Every structure is written in C-alpha cells, then in structure tokens.
Write an enzyme that holds these catalytic residues in place. Structure first.
Site, mmCIF file in Angstrom:
data_model
loop_
_atom_site.group_PDB
_atom_site.id
_atom_site.type_symbol
_atom_site.label_atom_id
_atom_site.label_comp_id
_atom_site.label_asym_id
_atom_site.label_seq_id
_atom_site.Cartn_x
_atom_site.Cartn_y
_atom_site.Cartn_z
ATOM 1 C CG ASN A 1 -9.690 -2.413 -0.975
ATOM 2 O OD1 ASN A 1 -8.472 -2.567 -0.879
ATOM 3 N ND2 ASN A 1 -10.417 -1.863 -0.013
ATOM 4 C CG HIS A 2 -8.421 2.275 -1.137
ATOM 5 N ND1 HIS A 2 -8.952 3.395 -0.622
ATOM 6 C CD2 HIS A 2 -8.300 1.381 -0.084
ATOM 7 C CE1 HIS A 2 -9.153 3.234 0.697
ATOM 8 N NE2 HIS A 2 -8.753 2.002 1.026
ATOM 9 C CG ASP B 1 -5.506 -0.345 -1.220
ATOM 10 O OD1 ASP B 1 -6.369 -0.557 -2.104
ATOM 11 O OD2 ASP B 1 -5.717 -0.590 -0.012
ATOM 12 C CG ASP C 1 -1.991 -1.080 1.160
ATOM 13 O OD1 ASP C 1 -1.704 -2.154 0.584
ATOM 14 O OD2 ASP C 1 -3.094 -0.879 1.718
ATOM 15 N NE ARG D 1 -10.190 -5.907 5.077
ATOM 16 C CZ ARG D 1 -9.173 -5.054 5.163
ATOM 17 N NH1 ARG D 1 -9.357 -3.750 4.980
ATOM 18 N NH2 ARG D 1 -7.955 -5.513 5.423
ATOM 19 C CG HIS E 1 -6.841 -5.673 1.876
ATOM 20 N ND1 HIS E 1 -7.385 -4.510 1.462
ATOM 21 C CD2 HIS E 1 -7.894 -6.461 2.327
ATOM 22 C CE1 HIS E 1 -8.713 -4.547 1.658
ATOM 23 N NE2 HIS E 1 -9.023 -5.743 2.182
ATOM 24 C CG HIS F 1 -3.536 3.895 1.375
ATOM 25 N ND1 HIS F 1 -4.661 3.769 0.645
ATOM 26 C CD2 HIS F 1 -3.472 2.769 2.198
ATOM 27 C CE1 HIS F 1 -5.279 2.622 0.971
ATOM 28 N NE2 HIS F 1 -4.551 2.009 1.923
ATOM 29 C CG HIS G 1 -5.127 -5.000 -2.421
ATOM 30 N ND1 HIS G 1 -4.122 -4.175 -2.089
ATOM 31 C CD2 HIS G 1 -6.214 -4.634 -1.632
ATOM 32 C CE1 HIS G 1 -4.539 -3.322 -1.139
ATOM 33 N NE2 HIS G 1 -5.821 -3.600 -0.863
ATOM 34 C CG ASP H 1 -9.034 6.645 -1.780
ATOM 35 O OD1 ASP H 1 -9.433 7.729 -2.255
ATOM 36 O OD2 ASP H 1 -9.598 5.551 -2.012
ATOM 37 N NE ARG H 2 -7.810 5.395 4.630
ATOM 38 C CZ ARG H 2 -8.039 4.154 4.211
ATOM 39 N NH1 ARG H 2 -7.134 3.509 3.482
ATOM 40 N NH2 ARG H 2 -9.181 3.553 4.529
HETATM 41 N N1 LIG Z 1 -15.889 5.507 9.994
HETATM 42 C C1 LIG Z 1 -15.853 4.178 10.260
HETATM 43 N N2 LIG Z 1 -16.045 3.721 11.525
HETATM 44 C C2 LIG Z 1 -16.015 2.404 11.815
HETATM 45 N N3 LIG Z 1 -15.795 1.454 10.883
HETATM 46 C C3 LIG Z 1 -15.579 1.763 9.574
HETATM 47 C C4 LIG Z 1 -15.598 3.181 9.178
HETATM 48 N N4 LIG Z 1 -15.366 3.208 7.846
HETATM 49 C C5 LIG Z 1 -15.213 1.924 7.430
HETATM 50 N N5 LIG Z 1 -15.341 1.061 8.457
HETATM 51 C C6 LIG Z 1 -15.235 -0.425 8.408
HETATM 52 O O1 LIG Z 1 -13.982 -0.827 8.977
HETATM 53 C C7 LIG Z 1 -13.184 -1.543 8.033
HETATM 54 C C8 LIG Z 1 -11.713 -1.135 8.115
HETATM 55 O O2 LIG Z 1 -11.457 0.155 7.548
HETATM 56 P P1 LIG Z 1 -10.051 0.512 6.839
HETATM 57 O O3 LIG Z 1 -9.118 -0.668 6.952
HETATM 58 O O4 LIG Z 1 -9.582 1.837 7.385
HETATM 59 O O5 LIG Z 1 -10.489 0.716 5.295
HETATM 60 P P2 LIG Z 1 -10.540 -0.496 4.218
HETATM 61 O O6 LIG Z 1 -10.942 0.085 2.877
HETATM 62 O O7 LIG Z 1 -11.367 -1.635 4.779
HETATM 63 O O8 LIG Z 1 -8.992 -1.000 4.185
HETATM 64 P P3 LIG Z 1 -7.957 -0.599 3.018
HETATM 65 O O9 LIG Z 1 -7.738 0.890 3.124
HETATM 66 O O10 LIG Z 1 -8.491 -1.219 1.748
HETATM 67 S S1 LIG Z 1 -6.098 -1.437 3.340
HETATM 68 C C9 LIG Z 1 -13.826 -1.296 6.683
HETATM 69 O O11 LIG Z 1 -13.722 -2.485 5.900
HETATM 70 C C10 LIG Z 1 -15.269 -0.987 7.001
HETATM 71 O O12 LIG Z 1 -15.994 -2.214 7.058
HETATM 72 MN MN LIG Z 2 -4.969 0.029 2.004
HETATM 73 MN MN LIG Z 3 -6.903 -2.445 0.570
#
Ligand SMILES: Nc1ncnc2c1ncn2[C@@H]1O[C@H](COP(=O)(O)OP(=O)(O)OP(O)(O)=S)[C@@H](O)[C@H]1O
Ligand SMILES: [Mn+2]
Ligand SMILES: [Mn+2]
Lengths: 290, 229, 301
Positions: free
Chosen positions: A114-115, A82, A54, A211, A238, A56, A164, A85-86
């Site tokens: 996935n991003h 990825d 990643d 997730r 990921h 990002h 990923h 984003d961010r």
């Molecule tokens: N604001 C939030 N508060 C709580 N849970 C969240 C929120 N946004 C997303 N989530 C959930 O929490 C999981 C983890 O979020 P992240 O790991 O930060 O983003 P992600 O897209 O799942 O991971 P990446 O960035 O692809 S490595 C996500 O898969 C969502 O199911």
């Molecule tokens: Mn990521």
């Molecule tokens: Mn990812």
C-alpha cells in the site's frame, strides 16, 4: 552485454548505500517496466524461495537480512511490499530491489504494498526523501509510475498465497485477481484496494477495516479461501510483529515483518520465511545492524 | 609467567548475559591463550570457547570462527582433529548465511596452516557430504567451499576429489545450484590441466548453455569465454 | 441547545477541500492558536487560577489512570499491542457519558452525548492498539467543545494547557508504555514525533523569548533534566530519550534539525505551519475526524 556491466556496478554501488543518479534511475525504471508488464497479477513463483515483509526504508537492516538469508542471486527472494516511507533510506532500498529485478528477474519477486503509491508516498516520507536527495520530483515520478506495474500477489508452487494486505469480499478465487487491472494508482476502495490493505483479525466473518481502507477477515474466511483455491497458507505482511512473524487463523495465515526495532522505538524482531526445496517453511528472526 | 592471571574474572566475562562483554572477552583470547600456554587454555578455557561456538547471537559465533585459526595454530593439528573438527563443520550448516560464509573462509585458513594433505584427510569428505543435502542453501555451500579450497589444495586433489562433485551438481533440480556450478568451473578451471578442461569441463558448460534457466545459460557462457574454450 | 452525535464526513481524497473550508477547521485551528497565545513565555509552575470544571477534568483523567492500574497487561501471546488495552478501552466506552456528566452542569446535560464522543476518540484505536496525533487532536477537539458550551471559560485557558492537557499526556504515556501501543501513522524520520504533536507547539510557546534557553539546548541532556519540570517541550524530549534507542540525531531526525533553529519564536511559528501541513491536511488522519453541531462540516460562517 554493455548493459549488464552497467547493472552490475549499480548493484555494487547500491550495496555501499550510495544512490544512483537521476539519469541512471530513469533507465532502471524504464527497463523494469518492460519486465514487470509480462508479470501476471498472480505472479507464478517457484520454491525454493525466501519470503520477506516490510522494510520501510531501513536499508542497513535490509543488508542484515541478506547476511541472514544469503545474497542475491544465490538466494531466491520474494518481497511483499512496503519498501519505502519512514526510514532514512527508502531511495537506496527500493533502487537496489529494482536493480536486482532487472538483473535477475527469475531470482526475485517484488510485490506491490500500500505504501507503493502516489497518495501514501506523499504522506509518509518517500516524496520528501527524493526531493532532498535529487533536487526535484523526477525520481519520485519514475518510481511511482513504476509502482503501478508491480504484481499484486504471488503464488509459490501453486500452494502458498503471498500478498501484502489480505483477502477481499469481492474476491473468491485467484481468477478474479487475474482479471483485474493493476496498472493504476491503488484505488480508494474495491478488490485491488483490499488485497493491499486488509488484515486478519480475531472475530468471525468480514468486517469494515478500522484503517479506513480494506476489510478485516476471520478464520472461517481464511479457511474457505484456502480450501476453495487449493492453498495451504496465506503469507502476508502489512502489520508490525514483536516476534518478527505471527501465526493466526489456525495456521491458515502468517504475518511477516522485516523492519526490526521499528521507529527506533518498538524493539521488535524482524523475520523472513525460508521455503524448502520441498515447500517446507522455517523462520529466521533477527535484530537490527549494530 | 601467567599463574597469577585473574582467570575467574575472564570466565565470568565469557559467560556474561550482556553480549558486548562476550564479544570483548573473545577479542582478548588471541593474546591471552598464547601467554597462558597450551595446557591451561585446553583445561580452563576451551569448554567456554565451545559453548560460544553455538551462542544464541550469531555475531558471537562469528567472532569465534575468526579466532578459530589462531586457536588451532596454538593447539596443534593432532588435538584439532579429536575435539575441534566438528565445531568447524557444524558451522557450514548454520541457519545464518554469514556464519556459513565465515566457516568457509575458515576452512581456507586452516588448510594454509595444516597443509593440503591434511585437508584431503579431514576436510574434503565432510564438505562433499553436503552436496546431497535436501536444502539448496546447503548444497550451494559445497560449491562455495570448493571455490575457496581448490586454490590451496593444488591441481591433483582438486581434479580427483573436488571436480567430480562439481560436474555431478550440473544436473541439479535447482537453477541456483546449476549456475553456481558454472561459476565454480570458472574459478577452479585455471588450476586443472587442459586435457581435463577440454574433455570433462567443456562438454558440461556447453550443455549448461542449453539450460532452460536464463542465469545458468549466462554464467555457463561466461565461464566458456573466460576459460577460452 | 441542539446537539447531535458526531459522525465522519471526509470519506474520499476529494472530500479534503470540504474539510479545509469548514467551520470545524476554522474553530479548531483558532482554538489551538488561542491556547498557544495564552501560555506564551510562562512556566508550568506559573501562578494561575483553577476552577471547579478544571479540577473535575483532572479527576476524570485520574479515573482513566485508575483503570489502567485495575487492568494490568495480560501474559498472553499477541501480535504487538497487549490485549488488556481492549478491556481498558471497553470501560471508557461504557462509562464515557457518565464521566463527562460530572464535568458538565445538569442544565447543559443534552450536550453530554455529543461531547463524550471526542473523548472516546482521544485515547487510541481499540482494534489496532494504536495511538497517533489524530487521537491527540480529538482530545483538543473535546476540550474545544467544552469552551463552546461555556463549561470552560477564558480564564481557564492557561489551566487547560498546563493542568488538564499536561495530565492527559502523562496518562497517554502510561498507556503507550503499559499496553505496548504502537504509533498510528508515524512519519518516521520525517515526522516530529511518532505519538504527539501539540505539546511541541504549546511547549515552544512557553520558551518564546527565554533569557537563556534556545532551541539548541534541548539536545543537551543536562539542560533538559534541570528544566523539564517547567517546560512541556522538554518533558517530551525526556520521554523520547527514555523510550528511543541510539544517538538523538538518529532516532529523532526532525527534532535534531529544529535544535539548529535560531529562536523558539521561529520554532513555534514553523511548528504551526507544519501541524497544518502534516496533520490537518493529511487524509489518513482527517478521514477519522468526526463532525457534529459544535464542530461542523458546513462552510465557515
Ligand atoms: N496521525 C494519525 N493519528 C491517528 N491515526 C492515524 C494517523 N495516521 C493514520 N492513521 C490511521 O491509523 C491506521 C494505522 O496507521 P499505520 O499502521 O501507522 O499506517 P498504515 O499505512 O495504515 O500501515 P502500513 O504502514 O501500510 S504497514 C491508518 O490506517 C490510518 O487509518
Ligand atoms: Mn508497512
Ligand atoms: Mn502496509
């Protein structure tokens, strides 16, 4: 070529962290699509090569990565998605990796994370960044349309499986993956979804992902998939890793994360994996740019 | 002149756990070591400089590489060969590209300081040793070195000792090494004589334009055009 | 009355309209805005009333604080988050209904199973070792349920934010530090904060029409240290300067922009719009919302 000069200065320009113009970005994505269409769902990759995770949008940390592992095209790279984003610099980051692909298609592989989709880029910054840096949604169009073409997985020397996310209960073989149609927005469910969303975990068997998309898989599943497909290793990203890279499932799986000190908060190292002339792996951990 | 210098304070700063104070104390060494004289820096400072040559943080290593040409200049050629040649070679094999890149530029500055005949004696062989390394990242360093070194080594050493290796590496299993042969030949070419160029360089580049790999083809074709062959 | 266990209902991106048009949403947003209004212009040290229900919610949170003390981080290798978080969470899973039943009177004991779900969803994800604004929302939803059943009353509105929600933040901050939790769904340099949102809304409400503190003052270290005891917004800034690296303008980009806003009034106003836009209308957050009898998915009535 008239267009190689053009490409060369673009790369030069992007290494100074200066974005291309809307018009330039359009051409770049058009020529990238032609190249990516010829690429398989399981894209054949030859070692030696360096495997990254990643980014990002952390462009200056990407520059640090090239300081550690060597610059393109001298060093062969493989990215597992990825890119956007961010961070402050999703545009510059992704524009360069795409630029380099069009310039040296045999020296880089860029995989879809996935991003790299229309839905998620509108949640975590990429849309916003494009709008603020270009004045309109066109650049976001040209990129998210291009993302549909990125290969889902890669295979180095037939032996190391790179993607990923992770494995899918629907996918037993690498042929099931080749059969798939990747030329669409990442779906909400199914095999394509799972490949870019899934995680390994510490309990046995399949498990519905916390997730809300994909599955979590245990060591026995990793052991079965590897053996069944003649694989020695599944290399994936990921997930955040404090040490940069993380072994699991009895070294059947490795997780590589390349965004150091994530969210200016986490204080993690980033890592990349060098694969030898003889497919031997070694890791390089690094901290951010000063 | 400097026999009241608080050198203990400096040594604490060089061995400091904090990285920033390591880097800042290295910035002083240039001016300090000159005023402290050959004998005192050799006895009191050099064991700490050697530690830092292999420091855990690469940016500390880099600063030592940049200080190396001044340190060799002060200490003279004869002492360099016995204690400091190894440091400089071990850097070319470093895991971090930036360290590999900087050890290369370092070789150039040392050659300008000690002359081309010394380079033939103490450097060229060690550089060519790497061409047989199992790792393509290391084999490429040989070419990067040859690129940089051919300038300051003159036509003859380039032709006799560096050129044959470049031509041999044209048959490498790895394409990245192969197109870097094409790039090397473009760089070192103008130094060689036309006879050597027409007889030994031209046939290799033409064979390289027949290579499976797209990048080898392109850079081989580009070298032929640039060298007007 | 008639209570059920809250379940998920937003399963797809098209299910996001169903949420927008739902009773739960109307109530939740109306609940946030109410608390917002009650704390307008008031310091944390303001003289307000504290009921038995409030003092027992704080105890609840203290019990959770106590369990972190009794569950230290293990010295095991892990991906990122410390595995001791799972041990801690498993205690909340087993004991949640009992803890709630100490806050809810015995005649409304049938409501305990429904209400306790929201608390269980309000402290981060056990599997991912996560915390995000979605968990923070669940706690607000938890508190919202206690009002709908009459446990908390209109007079408790200031106490809820200043005593109960404020103590809640201390416990989450502790969790995030102790177990090295990562941000669930952080928007990076485009989001308000990686972990929290709501305290920034209610916090800015306190600073509406402040005599001398303007939005430009929170990027001033001295102003923050001299005033954080009184203002929730500033406390959040103090944690950010404590937990993040670099110049403020680098790590907290969106907050740096906000310091350039003329009045706390427009800050509160804009943060409400942003909260709806960036949390309550974002699928990866809402997919994890749970709906029951108190906060239901049926169209607003
Ligand atoms: N604001 C939030 N508060 C709580 N849970 C969240 C929120 N946004 C997303 N989530 C959930 O929490 C999981 C983890 O979020 P992240 O790991 O930060 O983003 P992600 O897209 O799942 O991971 P990446 O960035 O692809 S490595 C996500 O898969 C969502 O199911
Ligand atoms: Mn990521
Ligand atoms: Mn990812």
């Amino acid at each position: 070529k008239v267009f190689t000069k053009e490409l060369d200065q673009w790369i030069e320009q992007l290494n100074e962290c200066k974005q291309l113009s809307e018009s330039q970005v359009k051409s770049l994505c058009e020529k990238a699509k032609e190249i990516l269409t010829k690429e398989s769902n399981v894209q054949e990759v030859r070692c030696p090569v360096t495997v990254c995770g990643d980014v990002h949008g952390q462009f200056h940390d990407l520059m640090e990565l090239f300081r550690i592992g060597g610059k393109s095209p001298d060093t062969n790279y493989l990215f597992m998605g990825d890119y956007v984003d961010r961070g402050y610099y999703s545009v510059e980051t992704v524009t360069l990796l795409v630029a380099l692909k069009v310039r040296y298609r045999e020296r880089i592989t860029i995989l879809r994370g996935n991003h790299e989709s229309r839905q998620i880029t509108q949640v975590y910054g990429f849309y916003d960044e494009c709008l603020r840096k270009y004045g309109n949604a066109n650049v976001w169009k040209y990129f998210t349309d291009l993302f549909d073409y990125l290969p889902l997985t890669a295979l180095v020397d037939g032996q190391i499986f790179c993607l990923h996310g992770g494995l899918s209960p629907s996918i037993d073989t690498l042929d099931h993956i080749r059969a798939l149609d990747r030329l669409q927005e990442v779906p909400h469910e199914g095999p394509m979804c799972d490949l870019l969303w899934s995680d390994p975990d510490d309990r046995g068997g399949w498990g519905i992902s916390p997730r809300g998309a994909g599955y979590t898989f245990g060591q026995d599943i990793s052991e079965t998939f590897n053996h069944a497909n003649g694989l020695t290793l599944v290399s994936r990203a990921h997930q955040l890793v404090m040490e940069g890279y993380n072994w699991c499932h009895d070294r059947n799986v490795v997780t590589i994360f390349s965004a150091p000190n994530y969210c200016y908060r986490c204080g993690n190292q980033a890592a990349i994996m060098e694969l030898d002339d003889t497919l031997k792996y070694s890791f390089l951990q690094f901290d951010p740019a000063p | 002149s400097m026999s009241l210098y608080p050198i203990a304070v400096l040594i604490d700063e060089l061995r400091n756990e904090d990285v920033q104070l390591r880097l800042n104390s290295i910035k002083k060494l240039s001016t300090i070591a000159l005023a402290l004289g050959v004998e005192r820096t050799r006895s009191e400072l050099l064991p700490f400089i050697v530690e830092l040559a292999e420091d855990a943080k690469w940016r500390v290593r880099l600063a030592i590489i940049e200080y190396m040409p001044l340190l060799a200049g002060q200490l003279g050629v004869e002492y360099f060969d016995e204690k400091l040649n190894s440091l400089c070679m071990a850097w070319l094999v470093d895991h971090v590209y930036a360290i590999r890149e900087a050890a290369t530029s370092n070789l150039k500055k040392l050659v300008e300081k000690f002359g081309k005949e010394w380079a033939h004696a103490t450097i060229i062989p060690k550089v060519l040793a790497m061409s047989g390394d199992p790792n393509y990242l290391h084999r490429m360093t040989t070419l990067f070195c040859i690129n940089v070194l051919s300038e300051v080594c003159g036509q003859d050493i380039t032709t006799k000792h560096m050129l044959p290796t470049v031509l041999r590496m044209a048959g490498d299993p790895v394409a990245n090494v192969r197109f870097n042969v094409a790039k090397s030949l473009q760089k070192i070419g103008p130094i060689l004589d036309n006879s050597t160029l027409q007889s030994e360089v031209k046939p290799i580049l033409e064979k390289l334009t027949q290579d499976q790999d797209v990048d080898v083809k392109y850079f081989a074709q580009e070298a032929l055009t640039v060298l007007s062959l | 009355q008639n209570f059920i266990i809250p379940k998920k209902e937003i399963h797809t991106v098209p299910d996001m309209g169903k949420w927008k048009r739902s009773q739960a949403y109307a109530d939740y947003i109306g609940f946030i805005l109410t608390l917002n209004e009650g704390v307008k212009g008031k310091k944390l040290t303001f003289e307000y009333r504290v009921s038995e229900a409030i003092e027992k919610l704080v105890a609840l949170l203290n019990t959770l604080d106590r369990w972190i003390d009794e569950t230290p981080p293990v010295d095991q290798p892990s991906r990122f988050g410390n595995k001791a978080y799972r041990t801690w969470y498993a205690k909340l899973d087993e004991e949640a209904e009992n803890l709630v039943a100490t806050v809810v009177p015995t005649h409304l004991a049938a409501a305990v199973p429904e209400v306790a779900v929201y608390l269980k969803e309000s402290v981060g994800n056990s599997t991912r070792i996560d915390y995000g604004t979605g968990h923070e929302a669940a706690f607000a939803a938890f508190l919202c349920c206690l009002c709908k059943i009459g446990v908390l009353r209109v007079d408790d509105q200031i106490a809820i934010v200043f005593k109960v929600f404020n103590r809640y933040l201390e416990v989450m901050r502790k969790l995030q530090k102790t177990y090295r939790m990562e941000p669930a769904g952080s928007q990076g340099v485009w989001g308000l904060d990686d972990f929290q949102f709501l305290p920034f809304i209610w916090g800015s409400s306190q600073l509406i029409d402040h005599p001398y503190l303007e939005p430009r003052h929170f990027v001033d270290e001295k102003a923050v240290n001299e005033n954080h005891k009184d203002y929730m917004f500033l406390e959040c800034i103090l944690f950010i300067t404590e937990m993040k690296t670099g110049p403020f303008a680098e790590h907290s980009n969106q907050l740096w922009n906000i310091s350039a806003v003329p009045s706390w009034s427009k800050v509160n106003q804009g943060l409400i719009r942003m909260y709806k836009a960036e949390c309550l209308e974002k699928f990866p957050v809402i997919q994890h919302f749970k709906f029951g009898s108190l906060l239901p998915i049926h169209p607003v009535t």
